[PDB]
Design a protein around this ligand. Structure first.
Ligand SMILES: *[C@@H]1O[C@H](CO)[C@@H](O[C@H]2O[C@H](CO)[C@@H](O[C@@H]3O[C@H](CO)[C@@H](O)[C@H](O[C@@H]4O[C@H](CO)[C@@H](O)[C@H](O[C@H]5O[C@H](CO)[C@@H](O)[C@H](O)[C@@H]5O)[C@@H]4O)[C@@H]3O)[C@H](O)[C@H]2NC(C)=O)[C@H](O)[C@H]1NC(C)=O
Ligand SMILES: *[C@@H]1O[C@H](CO)[C@@H](O[C@H]2O[C@H](CO)[C@@H](O)[C@H](O)[C@H]2NC(C)=O)[C@H](O)[C@H]1NC(C)=O
Ligand SMILES: C1CCN(C2CCNCC2)CC1
Length: 501
């Protein structure tokens, strides 16, 4: 039974042997990296954890952050890269991380560290549904899954000092700081930390890469199907949102301070209650697509983000380091009038003026294949809009700044089956995807230790220079070029025409 020291006290983990590997993996589940964000700490930045004198049992999955348990239980079942489906528990006391290390705790391990940031619209998700027991064993790295406040708890902002916002992101920063001051005890190398995640995790890594407060907290980043440029997860301000939330809770809105103070008085159940009423994770068709800003989000707080992401990216003066941006052509039938309507209704999620709406349709869903079955093109443009286009834009920005860049197209969650090696400790699928998994983890890890995904036994992966070299992964893995170049062109131009209407 492994007992490791930490700045705050000792933790007791457990050994797990993965068939096919000589060395066990030491696992620590539910290690606190902060003080429980209760009472006055709700809607505040994370405070350090108080020290403890006993040896802390860390062999049990910590609870996940307050969230929609139905949407939370479902996303957890559809993303677990294991066979067992963990018995979830939710609480505001959710600031914990899980550690998977293959290092020999008896020695001075200096293995690269990979910190996984789960996705889930910043509304749901947890670190436990992900298992680094395979990636750590297969690639010889230390894997850390972190948790962060979600929904109201994590992103409620009044646009000023009484509740700046981005608590969820400040929790990610705190875990990264924790890794710095402690991972060495687990055979991890704080000098080689790689942050990675998909969807909302993907954009979080992007946000963190652009934040002034992450200097030296990590050394490489991987965004999968999500970048700082997602219009759904960022908004310069959310005062009106904060007000709708305060009212739904039965709080006055006289001031920012009165709002926050009243909300701090609410109960987790009461706030959970408001969350459900607000109906965040869901598209609202009826009404005007511009009044439904019911989406808690990343904002400009002058702390994590001094200014909007688009601009910080433009200034080219953020944390310059290896960044791997990738996507999966999937979000996982109708006519051109109804589809074009769904686009307008999906305004909050994709911000596409009604004016434009038809154009995009008649372009993607254009007068090519009139069939209804072949309107899966809608789902393609809807993806390019969500992450496809933004990703490339983010990449181009990074490259254009002189930072090692890389892209790839896997052929939401599926890459995860490969990234965390589901094909081993799960159902047992196509011996074909099982090798696909090993190839993936290989790139991620080589990138983790070198900032270059390349290695022996793996097809060439071109840097993301000006030839737009990117890797194509799937049943057959090859290299390609100009990812979403045509799609980006049509949009950057379309949105150009209305630059001076
Ligand atoms: C909902 O839909 C609308 C319309 O489709 C979205 O459009 C935009 O609204 C703003 C209109 O004013 C745009 O931002 C402004 O215009 C351009 C953006 O291209 C900027 O040049 C403007 O000023 C910036 O100031 C900083 C100061 O440090 C400079 O560094 C900037 O320079 C670069 O940064 C911009 C960032 O957008 C880049 O495009 C270029 O590399 C610039 O060279 C720049 O001088 C000003 O920001 C935006 O493009 C866009 N959104 C906003 C409000 O910024 C709208 O965004 C969308 N809303 C939602 C829900 O997302
Ligand atoms: C550490 O925590 C574990 C889990 O909470 C404690 O033992 C329990 O978990 C085991 C599985 O790991 C089960 O097999 C046991 O049944 C269960 N305990 C009971 C009630 O039988 C364990 O006591 C704690 N102490 C240490 C340091 O191991
Ligand atoms: C014009 C081009 C792209 N946008 C926008 C369009 C829709 N909102 C998010 C990106 C900013 C300015």
């Amino acid at each position: 039974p492994p007992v490791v020291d930490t700045v705050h006290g000792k933790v007791l983990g457990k050994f797990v042997s993965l068939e096919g590997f000589a060395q066990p993996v030491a696992v620590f589940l539910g290690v606190p990296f902060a003080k429980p964000p209760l009472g006055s700490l709700r809607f505040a930045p994370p405070q350090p954890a108080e020290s403890w004198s006993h040896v802390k049992n860390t062999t049990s999955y910590p609870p996940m952050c307050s969230q929609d348990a139905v949407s939370g239980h479902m996303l957890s079942e559809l993303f677990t890269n294991r066979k067992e489906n963990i018995p979830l528990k939710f609480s505001e006391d959710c600031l914990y991380l899980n550690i998977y290390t293959p290092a020999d705790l008896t020695k001075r391990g200096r293995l690269p560290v990979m910190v996984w940031i789960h996705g889930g619209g910043l509304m749901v998700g947890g670190a436990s549904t992900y298992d680094g027991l395979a990636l750590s064993a297969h690639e010889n790295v230390v894997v850390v899954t972190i948790q962060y406040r979600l929904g109201i708890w994590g992103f409620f902002s009044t646009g000023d000092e009484h509740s700046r916002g981005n608590w969820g992101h400040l929790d990610q920063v705190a875990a990264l700081r924790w890794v710095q001051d402690n991972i060495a005890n687990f055979g991890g190398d704080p000098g080689s930390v790689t942050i990675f995640g998909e969807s909302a995790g993907g954009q979080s890594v992007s946000i963190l890469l652009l934040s002034p407060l992450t200097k030296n907290l990590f050394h490489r980043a991987i965004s999968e199907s999500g970048v700082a440029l997602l219009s759904s997860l960022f908004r310069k301000n959310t005062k009106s949102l904060a007000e709708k939330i305060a009212i739904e809770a039965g709080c006055k809105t006289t001031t920012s301070a009165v709002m926050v103070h009243c909300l701090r008085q609410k109960t987790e159940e009461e706030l959970m209650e408001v969350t459900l009423k607000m109906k965040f994770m869901a598209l609202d068709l009826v009404g005007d697509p511009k009044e439904n800003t019911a989406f808690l989000t990343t904002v400009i707080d002058g702390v994590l983000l001094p200014k909007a992401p688009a601009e910080i990216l433009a200034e080219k003066k953020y944390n310059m380091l290896p960044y791997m941006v990738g996507i999966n052509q999937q979000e996982f039938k109708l006519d051109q009038k109804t589809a074009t309507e769904l686009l307008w209704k999906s305004y909050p999620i994709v911000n596409v003026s009604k004016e434009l709406t038809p154009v995009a349709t008649e372009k993607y869903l254009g007068g090519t294949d009139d069939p209804v079955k072949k309107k899966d093109l809608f789902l393609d443009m809807l993806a390019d809009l969500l992450f496809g286009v933004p990703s490339v834009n983010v990449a181009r920005h990074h490259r254009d700044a002189g930072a090692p860049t890389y892209m790839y197209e896997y052929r939401h969650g599926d890459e995860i089956f490969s990234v965390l090696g589901a094909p081993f400790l799960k159902e047992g699928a196509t011996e074909e995807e099982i090798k696909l998994s090993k190839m993936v983890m290989k790139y991620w890890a080589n990138f983790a230790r070198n900032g270059n995904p390349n290695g022996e036994g793996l097809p060439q992966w071109p840097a993301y220079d000006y030839k737009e070299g990117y890797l194509q992964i799937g049943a057959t893995t090859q290299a390609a070029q100009k990812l979403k170049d045509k799609e980006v062109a049509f949009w950057t131009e379309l949105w150009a025409k209305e630059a001076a209407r």
